Amino acid sequence: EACKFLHQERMDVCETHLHWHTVAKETCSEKSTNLHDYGMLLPCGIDKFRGVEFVCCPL
Ligand SMILES: [Cu+2]
Ligand SMILES: [Cu+2]
Ligand SMILES: [Cu+2]
């Protein structure tokens, strides 16, 4: 079925991998979907990034 491709780039923040994975996970849940693949964007340190892209699919 149709899944949704989403990404966030926030130049005003620099956050851990876990933070961004939580953002992706919770965004999909908010939309009544499940997180499939995801990837970190705009690194700002070792294992810190300024964004994330991810895919949400129907439960
Ligand atoms: Cu973009
Ligand atoms: Cu999971
Ligand atoms: Cu997953």
Domain containing residue 46: CATH number: 3.30.1490.140
Q: Which ligand has the minimum distance to the alpha carbon of residue 11?
A: 1
This PDB structure is determined at a resolution in Å of 2.4
When divided into structural domains, the chain yields a total of 1
Annotated binding site for Cu(2+): 17, 21, 38
Rounded distance between C-alpha atoms, residue 35 and residue 12, angstroms: 25
With CA atoms as reference, report the closest residue to 37 among 19, 25, 49: 25
Q: Which ligand has the minimum distance to the alpha carbon of residue 10?
A: 1
Write b or e for each residue in 26-59: b if 16 or more Cβ atoms lie within 10 A of its Cβ, otherwise e.
Answer: ebbeeeebebeebebeeeeeeebbbbbbbbbeee
Largest CA distance in the chain: 37
CA 38 to centroid of ligand 3, rounded, Å: 7
Answer yes or no: are the C-beta atoms of 7 and 57 closer than 8 Å: no
Domain coverage including residue 38: 1-59
Tell me how the structure was determined.
X-ray
Q: Which ligand has the minimum distance to the alpha carbon of residue 54?
A: 3
CA 29 to centroid of ligand 2, rounded, Å: 10
